[PDB]
């Protein structure tokens, strides 16, 4: 009306008035203002019942929709009834008051900049024969303790030793031996629930592979019972996306780890793998707060562990090392002890494989070498072969450590390239050429004639590994490993596609594509040399 | 069966009521639906990438799969939990409650270039806004899109969702699209892709924002190192045959560093070109004057022979010289969206700047622009250039894409997509989309 | 015509905020006072170091002139308010536009 | 520990391997963030300290692993301008540190 005139309605009830109101506003076509006159602290239900139905810009209760009462203004802080526009007429177009950002145009300029590389380690480690008593001697008043182990090893006269030493000053403990070859999404929560019933304050990780890392996982689940778990995985998938925060531990428990298998560097790495229960979805966890603060590397354990599981672990470590050195993530830092472990292993593998426990020299030597390898790729990530072998082990239940050991050969032949600039990225930046690096390894072992070219040294290198791995009595084609090959061909197709993106990604200097993986897989299965 | 306005309007009523009682949900319960939907869309990127490979027709698989990776994870990490239900903020001192509320029914337009990522994107953010979304797949790429519609709705349903929140079209057709796009019940429309498309979108009398791009120029001065930029834009140029938004369209080279850059391309798979093959490719480049629609995502050898000339096979991009003229009529001036590029011969810094500004305006949308130069000897140059250029976004010594070594290059940035504007007109600096663009306000004063 | 004065100074002042240039379409009813304000505010601005003008405004405003400048190429934006019929032609421009208007403003009173 | 005197901090803990018996008990109410500046000293990682007396300058060496700072940062921005041959002095100190360390009887495989 816009004039000193008004028409009224005769409403029936609260809801009748509300209906008439909504119907009345829509006629304007712009939701601007609407008013409620009512009792105010006997009726809140009414307040926001009414608020729920009405879509103006702005609701006032027991207030005139203007400016200027007594003194300052009624109401004294509010935009004017004008200044409320919208970019649309259409309907329900809730007006918004105007601001200079509606009158101003933007810029962001992003800068070019450099990155962060890394080297971080667990603080505390011990290493000898009979470490255990003298290692744990420094365990004063840490009062509650929890065991993580496997029923095979707990079944052996091993756990008894540590619980006795826990009684030595006397700890309230409980053994947990209820993990099989893998983290499951099933034991993890029962273990978490049991210990959080116990509220232990020290966690004892025992063994090889699955027992330790699953613990870590459910360990952290004790730290935050509140959160769900995907986003622990989904949020933190790999390195260098330090975005943004931690699940917040160091809290109410510490980690003391005991390896048993010579060949896994897991007990130092901040890594974990968990498997889903429908279809076994892989979930990789990787961030440095996962590193245990306590690591002990005794030997007493493996004098009696038989061949060639020895070989399996050693070959896993071997793979870890050679991939780590050539990794694009390789700083100078990992090169030192990676080279060290590689050099020092070449003598003590044949002896320990042939001799043990008659040779209580080579066994602990290769144990330490494997630990050093774990030190190495703790910062340099894995190679494509590693997750790919994860896969081959996955479908055919093949153990880790030898599955990759069947691959390494062709793998470096894939790296055996002069300059294919087909898919490589940023080649001449920090990684001049892998071939040279390999040759440095070769002559660095002295595996080369003083007068040689690179490729000469390279073939010497992988010949060395060839009959070296001959020495340890392993099949040379995966068919010789006992695999039905018709289905191999049938299912290698999708095997390769998941082999591509399985976190490899990957410091692999060169891109693979789906095709090359397939060539390599078939060549390795037949023991054929992948060469082009 | 989605074919006629009978069943179209029926399903409109269906999803529309479903939104009506959907919008009544508490934040801490829609969150679970959120997590589950994100997860269940998250793992199976490989399938829809693969059957996108078959349905759409071109392109590279892993680019597609990891765009799905990046898109899903960006979306979730992008919007973990931001208060969108009920009260937003309170002033008990003045009794001013500010709350928010969903908008309504929205249509979604799906281009063939990214038929998958866009759909999940829109749908996921919609269930964020407690919305209902309608899809207009392209008759090219619809089956994979409808498969995604199934899959994501199935995840949502196995979380407590109303029986549907998706609508999408079977055998999409223009009249159906105009009917729903002009449907009364719809509250908004989200279009992207062809310039011609969003203009009909704006021609609606209804709120509309379109995500597009213009010709994306880069200029190179004498004080930059050649091989660096050469590298970066080979990676971007080759990305799934250069079909991503905000990708290379014009190479601007200052005077005396020119032929050396050119042989640097010649030292690589790029094929320079200065003869009648200019016309030989410009025919199919712009046949109808409207950007002939099968150069899209096609390999360099394919587009060379299918332009009529035979080329060394491993070549990656063809390079055009017949670009001394600067105007619309140049087909190199328009965007290419294929592993092809044309360059300029600039005289000085300011010549290149002038050509750049003239080049951008042709796109009509200020989206992206690139400077390759020395960086701490020249700041005057930096923001001289910054002063003249009005794209959305300036990058110096950087490719205008996503994914280098490790995290991303650059590792914190919105995608070249997701950048729309409420206007086409000119200098319309794109802004990336957010839920306040999808949510309505309230203050109640006490 | 309802608020010929406050709106003009409002827009002009916030414009000089945005370092803008603003064009006015006064109503043939209420233009002389508006143009007087245009004078006065520009004069204040000039006696502060402003460029010789930042205001434009129409003498004897007419519909065709309004459509011509409203459809002028050089203009970057338009700010309309008032009659519903007015802002609808404003939206019918193919150009960015926002209109300040209102609808029927209802109040309801209960028994309590 | 404001309470204790200081000799026995030195007198009690003179070198390595006499882990007899306890700590002065820190990790307490402050943390350590260290920035080296001189290329050639590994002090900012070592749990070592040297203090000199005031009569005659009696040397007091302190050595035990809880002295290690939890935080170490090694930037370069610092020494582009530090002149020759103080560069050489630090580098040669580090050189000595290394060659002695390798041949030391305490040398495990770890330091090699």
UniProtKB/TrEMBL annotation, chain B:
Keywords: Iron, Metal-binding, Multifunctional enzyme, NAD, Oxidoreductase. The keyword Zinc does not apply. Coiled coil: none annotated. One of its GO terms (molecular function) is acetaldehyde dehydrogenase (acetylating) activity. Residues 4-400 form the Aldehyde dehydrogenase domain. The keyword Translocase does not apply. One of its GO terms (biological process) is alcohol metabolic process. In the C-terminal section; belongs to the iron-containing alcohol dehydrogenase family. In the N-terminal section; belongs to the aldehyde dehydrogenase family. This is Aldehyde-alcohol dehydrogenase. The lineage of its organism: Bacteria, Pseudomonadati, Pseudomonadota, Gammaproteobacteria, Vibrionales. The chain holds residues 2 to 447 of 894 of the full protein.
